[PDB]
Amino acid sequence: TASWFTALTQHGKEDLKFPRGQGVPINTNSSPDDQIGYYRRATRRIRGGDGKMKDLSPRWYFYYLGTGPEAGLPYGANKDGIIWVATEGALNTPKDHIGTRNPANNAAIVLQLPQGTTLPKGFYA
């Protein structure tokens, strides 16, 4: 139960957003029907080298529709820390056949977006 992909890191103050049709990570081993899901914000509060509590940049992880922590949400569900992406031609059906990644069995895929798609403002990898 992990994302198939590495995270997008939020350095800026804006939540992640993509224009309609953009933001689905490249996965050559998946069908055009599969190209739909959400990014989920994950936050960390950690102790620094000075021994004080610190807020790390929020990280956003991609999950295919009907997988991951919000497997039960339908496409477009309005919820804080959840944003939706879909490529033209994707089917609005759960991607049970893809599921989530077992870190014991598989490494994360480095998240890459199609040439032309730019990371939204304040996002780095």
Residue nearest to Zn ion according to CB distances in the complex? 11
Binding-site member from 31, 92, 106, 118 for Zn ion (CB under 5 A)? 31
Binding-site member from 17, 21, 22, 69 for its own copies (CB under 8 A)? 69
| Shortest separation between residue 70's beta carbon and its own copies, angstroms | 9
The structure tokens listed for 91 are: 């089917």
Length of the chain: 125
At residue 32, what are phi and psi to the nearest 5 degrees?
A: -55, -35
Contacts (Cβ under 8 Å, ≥6 apart) of 72? none
Is 47 one of the annotated binding-site residues? no
DSSP single-letter state for residue 120? P
Which residues lie near its own copies (CB under 8 A)? 1-2, 6-9, 11-12, 28-31, 33-34, 46, 48-50, 52, 54-57, 63, 66-69, 71-72, 94, 96-100, 102-112, 122, 124-125
